[PDB]
Amino acid sequence: ARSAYSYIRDAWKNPGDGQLAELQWQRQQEWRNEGAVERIERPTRLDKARSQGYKAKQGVIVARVSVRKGSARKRRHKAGRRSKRQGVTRITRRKDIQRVAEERASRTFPNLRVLNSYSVGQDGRQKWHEVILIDPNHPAIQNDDDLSWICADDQADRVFRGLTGAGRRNRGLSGKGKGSEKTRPSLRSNGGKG
Template sequence: MYTYIAEAWNTPSESYVKQLQWSRLIEWRKEENFVKIDHPTRLDRARKLGYKAKQGYIIVRGRVRKGSLRKRKIRKGRRAKRRGINKITMAKSLQRIAEERACKKYPNLEVLNSYWVGMDGQHEWFEIIMVDPHHPVIKADKNINWICSPKQKGRAYRGLTAAGKAGRGLKWKGKGAEKVRPSIGAHNRKGK
């Protein structure tokens, strides 16, 4: 079953997902930026990223504005080239921003992972898998109780989710492969 769901979501514009998305986005635009939902929209992706249909797991659908970092117009003196309003790219992906904002809205939960669910001309939507580290069911489950450790507090802010690690250049490419880049400290030591 998960294979068929994954195939449909690989190219949403060429499958039944396109028609579903049309009606869904109309509803999602009317909602708040971050909403708790009962079931994941992409069950295959949620399960792959660690979601379980049991107590302590919460799915939050978050909306983030698309586009680069648009800054306010500078009123003081500079030449036009140095104003720095347009063409400033964020160092973080929209997915990371969505995870951080969800973490801020629900401070008692920890972000486990997230995945893309849709976009239109102005916004992108992500579903964020969140876990309640104080829930007795989570504490009793040996597969997920590592998230109850105080060291896991604020995972999204520190770039410890999959999207965060990708943004920090720590994504591995296969077994025994090198990192995409060295750490910032290692890079600084190289020059000496």
């Protein structure tokens, strides 16, 4: 039979309808008064969190981060530039907002490592994402068969090197065939043309 979790999932398919709509309209009022990174005891989307690796266990942390909506907050050129490079308004950053959110969270918890993250909506001027971070030094995690992998040295600052799920998709690594000629194995090894 349907899991209870399937109901949370189904509700989030349409965040502008039903009970969820009323919930968001109420919550965001409190969220807009909260800071940039807020640690929360329980995930707003339990199903999504568990699906991404979350566990109600010691050393597993969740935090909601708000990031402004829109394009690059860019300064206009202050020296010679050909027309092509004179733009300001239409330039957008190459890292998606979700990834920015993930980095802001990881910076807040220097000892923790980003496991994954997901969206929890947006209003007219900002987006919110909840990031799942893990304590690679806590023994409750070092002994977990499903999570201990994140404790390895080569996983340090994984979010900053694009090793996150949002990092990998944003790097164009989703496809294994056509279209990934300049993305795999890395954008840098491919000359930065991905």
